[PDB]
């Protein structure tokens, strides 16, 4: 179930800095900022020209690890992302952004991704009226994500909701900071998502 374990252990390995912890992973010590190398006993020696396979693996893991989505879903959602008319490149990336908890994280609310999930698994999060608790819930157009009321007074929801004053949300989401709402104006775009991932490879890895 959703990994759970040494994550700023993958900020490493994938060698492409990751902030799955948020605050710290954002500090002068993303773990990455002290060891730009993979873990293990070796981790700092010549590296064989990674095979054509390896690259794709790493590209995929880069992405999948970047959400916490466990393979099964990851790869599953991928297939849906295939039949759907269009470029799998956009689509998929888009269908990865439609992930409730994700958006949660995408719209402040939670410092990081792994945290945004729990907010969902406890009710704290709410949609177009009625609340929801499935991290897999897929957001659709014109739907706002609101915090619950019992929470609004919680020490956490505060500080986290504060970091919004000043900072602007992604070009496909709004935000009633005082009224914790913000809608999902439209599926995000390749460019809007500045992710250290080369989707086109992650795609090739599922061909074989």
């Amino acid at each position: 179930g959703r990994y759970i374990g040494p994550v700023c252990r993958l900020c490493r390995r994938e060698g492409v800095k990751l902030y799955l912890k948020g605050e710290r992973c954002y500090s002068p010590k993303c773990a990455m900022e002290r060891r730009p190398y993979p873990p293990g006993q070796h981790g700092q020696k010549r590296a064989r020209r990674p095979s054509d396979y390896a690259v794709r693996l790493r590209e995929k893991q880069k992405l999948r690890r970047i959400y916490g989505i466990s393979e099964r879903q990851f790869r599953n959602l991928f297939e849906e992302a295939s039949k759907k008319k269009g470029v799998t490149g956009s689509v998929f990336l888009g269908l990865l952004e439609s992930r409730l908890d994700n958006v949660v994280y995408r719209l402040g609310f939670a410092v990081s991704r792994r945290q945004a999930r729990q907010l969902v698994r406890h009710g704290h999060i709410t949609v177009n009226g009625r609340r929801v608790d499935l991290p897999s819930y897929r957001v659709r157009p014109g739907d706002e994500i609101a915090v619950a009321e019992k929470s609004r007074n919680l020490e956490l929801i505060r500080q986290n909701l504060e970091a919004m004053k000043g900072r602007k949300v992604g070009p496909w989401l709004s935000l009633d900071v005082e009224g914790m709402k913000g809608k999902f104006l439209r599926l995000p775009d390749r460019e809007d998502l500045a992710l250290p991932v080369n989707e086109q490879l992650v795609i090739e890895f599922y061909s074989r």
Partner: protein, 150 residues
Amino acid sequence: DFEEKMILIRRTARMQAGGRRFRFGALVVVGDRQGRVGLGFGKAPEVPLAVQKAGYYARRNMVEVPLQNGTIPHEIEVEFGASKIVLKPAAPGTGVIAGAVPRAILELAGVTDILTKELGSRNPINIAYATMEALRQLRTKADVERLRKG
């Protein structure tokens, strides 16, 4: 300048009184991901040396590819030796559906969407060359017409 990407390096041997003496083979493909690729096979007593050499010939055995939206004008089945290769145009998003050797070329040529299939002997060198003839032989509605004018 271009991308450069080797398809395969290999070590061969010839015999002598004192046993076997070796030599290396670098099959390098180079391009700009926007119309120009070239293949070159270099041979030398040291790998390094061979791959640099295969790079040199590489730029000399070039070929204009008529890219069209990331794909190839039509489909061609070129045979070389006992190595056959088939290129069939694809729609945007498809990507490159080929093996390591032909992909390396098609990708450095700037091809983005393409259906491929190796038939017959899959020898790397031979397929690799059969791929260049293949790309070399493509035409566009444009040059087909300047052929049957009147």
